Design a protein around this nucleic acid. Structure first.
Lengths: 97, 203, 55, 199
RNA sequence: AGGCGAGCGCCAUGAUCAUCACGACACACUUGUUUAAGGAC
RNA sequence: GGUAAUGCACAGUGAAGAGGUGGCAGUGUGCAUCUAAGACUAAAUACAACAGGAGACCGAUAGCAAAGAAGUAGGUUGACCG
RNA sequence: ACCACACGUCCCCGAAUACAGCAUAGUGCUGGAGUACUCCUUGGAAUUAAGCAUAUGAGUAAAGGAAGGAAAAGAAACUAACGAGGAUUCCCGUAGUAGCGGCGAGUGAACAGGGAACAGUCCAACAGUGUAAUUCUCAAAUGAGAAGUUGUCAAAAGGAAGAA
């Protein structure tokens, strides 16, 4: 059997290359900026025209009573992900302020 | 532009305006016959993502499907076999409910090709869909440069062979280790490649 | 192996070979599938999977 | 053959009309029963807006201004192109939802008309809120056909104007003041009242 | 924000969200009472 | 094969514009790699009827059921059988 | 005379239709046959476990739908942790392995490494506003009308080779 002869320490070694730095892409052109602005604008109009959904109302009500941990549990069960819940709570909080 | 505003409103399905419109439209769809022709698309943005234009030789039809799982077709629950294969209820279909809509529209509109389909509503009993159809024997279409491909003879009855957006999803196709069951083209293509004995000349 | 055949079983004063189901012809009741039968199948039929070449 | 009365049509069950001969009647049963349902239930504030529109008198006043900026016909267009370029840039009234929304967004548009009887409505639903945010005046008209007649062609969803000839300026300003009264000035109050069932 | 027994639990009543019967209308749904009858059952 | 879910469905519930994955459940945090929910695509691969060429194959109880007017003579109420 | 190549003629029943469903400005299209090979559904039991109920045979048989000379697939919400590679399909191989399993009987893949053949592109998001510039019909040598603003319209002839 030609397997499992080296230790983990010696398997971790590596050859000394010379690396190339990554080309950063930070510049964003004028036309790309206007494009992003118009999309964010459109998102405002929808919220203005049609308002909040039932679970969003129930959520925001709990935030007024400082029921932070109840709101957390509630949102987790509605959206599934604990990450989506943490994000949606932060967006709702900012809307109320 | 205009199509962006429509997208954002169509996504808010529990806004007051969308609850209003879903209620009134689902009432009307159920008073009509089970497959009927529409005047135009209900949602302009969605139909245009999927390839609709308002030119001669394209149409929208609308279809309804009954909801829930589909029971085993046996009398009195008698299956004549082993007990692990005796269940009748809680058996779920392999294809989406959408796939049934596409298959039935294609039978009725036999002179035309099924392009794509989308959701338009639900209630306690039915689910409702719009199907985009094209006519390959039409001078306008034969000379188009974007949908002229549908006239190739291989494009007959795409829906029956699991090739449309609604019918494709039950096949299990994809890229990576999570889809090893379909390496080769399909489940049956993988089966053949795995259950064959190769007998070379010199051996 | 083409024909419809079945054994008559014991109690008929005949050997229990499969026999041909028919009527109207002399072929009725004749002995069908086995290697010891006229028009039956050969023992261990020759087959393409044999090893033809040699190393 | 015979025209059925309103009472009859409201009585019939559409699902029991089944023969090929009966299809036109099935259509009429559905049409009348839908009307009764929509009058019975409350409208959200945004949909309720399109219940308020100009009088036939105001429509006349507005049309009698706008008609002087009619678009070119194909006959006119051909002639123009055989001749050379001459004179100043024309003023023309503009049409179609795609162009209008662009001109609102670019803050080019100066006054806008919108039609009410549009199906599906989601095409025009957002225009008043966008007009209020950009600060452009507007007015609502009953039918798509009312608009078609102004520009002497097929019905449309909306019309727009981006410029004013000095000749017209006095009348123009008065019209805008009338419109602001019925429409733009009232907006913030309107977005909070639900449409009552109709008596 | 009131009252009782050597701030405690117990007894008063005043604001905040669901919510179970009962009424009275008509719009879903039901029935050849059908230019009609029921009715959120 | 997919093991505290590999893929596919049905009912409830239901996102974000930024998200998905790194074969063992969870929470946090850097790092690497990609961009789903719309479409098209040649060549290299598979195999009947019908035609052509070959063979250490069978030689009229064999070889296809059938080397002649063979799916024929003939038979089943019938499906079918020969 | 006779033969070989093509054409003309081609009774009645049969999808069998003076019909059904459906599209266009209009002309029209579908239906039945075939289905070895390819794609999509539905779905057994004999048998093995020396009994048998989970499991096996097997996602096989049977029954339905559909297409072509092939069909399906296909240009990474992909692998990998190397000093990394780079669409799909096929062959050699990893491998009767990692694992699944009354952990019994039995089942069972992937990347690498060596090759055959090689090719990349479209729609939406996002079309001239000093004028729908776009498609179709009839006339005419320059007019009438239909579709369309709930959005139309984003360019080349051309050739000698190769094979039967």
């Amino acid at each position: 059997m030609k397997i499992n002869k080296l230790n983990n320490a010696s398997k971790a070694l590596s050859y000394p290359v010379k690396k190339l730095a990554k080309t950063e892409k930070a510049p964003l052109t004028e036309k790309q900026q206007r494009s992003k602005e118009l999309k964010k604008f459109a998102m405002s109009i929808a919220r203005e025209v049609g308002g909040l959904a039932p679970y969003e109302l129930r959520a925001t009500e709990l935030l007024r009573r400082d029921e932070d941990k109840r709101c957390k549990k509630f949102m987790k069960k509605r959206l599934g992900s604990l990450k989506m819940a943490k994000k949606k709570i932060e967006l709702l909080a900012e809307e109320m302020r | 532009g205009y199509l962006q505003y429509l997208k954002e409103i169509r996504r808010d399905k529990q806004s007051s305006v969308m609850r209003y419109l879903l209620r009134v439209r689902c009432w009307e769809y159920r008073q009509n016959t089970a497959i009927h022709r529409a005047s135009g698309p209900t949602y302009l943005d969605k139909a245009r993502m999927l390839g609709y234009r308002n030119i001669p030789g394209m149409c929208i039809f609308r279809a309804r499907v009954r909801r829930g799982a589909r029971p085993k077709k046996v009398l009195k629950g008698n299956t004549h076999g082993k007990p692990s294969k005796s269940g009748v209820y809680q058996r779920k279909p392999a294809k989406r409910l959408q796939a049934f809509a596409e298959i039935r529209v294609g039978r009725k509109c036999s002179n035309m090709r099924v392009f794509n389909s989308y959701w338009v509503g639900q209630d306690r009993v039915y689910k409702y869909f719009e199907v985009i159809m094209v006519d390959p024997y039409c001078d306008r279409i034969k000379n188009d440069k974007k949908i002229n491909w549908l006239c190739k003879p291989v494009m007959k009855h795409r829906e029956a062979r699991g090739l449309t957006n609604g019918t494709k999803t039950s096949r299990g196709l994809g890229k990576g280790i999570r889809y090893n069951q379909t390496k080769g083209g399909s489940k049956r293509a993988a089966w053949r490649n795995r259950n064959t004995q190769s007998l070379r000349r010199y051996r | 192996m083409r024909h419809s055949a079945k054994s008559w079983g014991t109690g008929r004063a005949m050997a229990r070979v499969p026999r041909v189901r028919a009527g109207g012809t002399r072929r009725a009741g004749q002995g069908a599938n086995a290697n010891f039968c006229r028009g039956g199948r050969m023992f261990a039929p020759t087959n393409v999977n044999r090893r033809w070449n040699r190393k | 053959d015979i025209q059925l009365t309103k009472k009859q049509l409201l009585s019939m069950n559409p699902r029991k009309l089944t023969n090929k001969a009966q299809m036109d009647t099935r259509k009429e049963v559905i049409a009348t029963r839908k009307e009764a349902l929509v009058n019975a239930i409350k409208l959200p504030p945004a949909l309720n807006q399109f219940t308020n529109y100009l009088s036939e008198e105001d429509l006349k006043e507005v049309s009698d201004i706008l008609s002087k900026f009619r678009p070119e016909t194909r006959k006119e267009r051909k002639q123009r192109l055989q001749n050379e370029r001459k004179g100043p840039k024309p003023i023309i009234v503009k049409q179609g939802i795609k162009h209008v929304t662009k001109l609102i967004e670019e803050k080019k548009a100066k006054f806008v008309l919108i039609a009410c009887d549009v199906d599906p409505i989601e095409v025009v639903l957002y225009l008043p809120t966008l007009c209020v945010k950009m600060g452009i005046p507007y007015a609502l008209v009953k039918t798509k056909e009312d608009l078609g007649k102004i520009i002497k062609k097929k019905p449309t969803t909306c019309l727009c104007l981006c410029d004013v000839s000095s000749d017209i300026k006095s009348k123009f300003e008065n019209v805008i003041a009338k419109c602001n009264g019925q429409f733009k000035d009232n907006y913030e109050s309107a977005m909070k009242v639900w449409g009552s069932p109709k008596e």
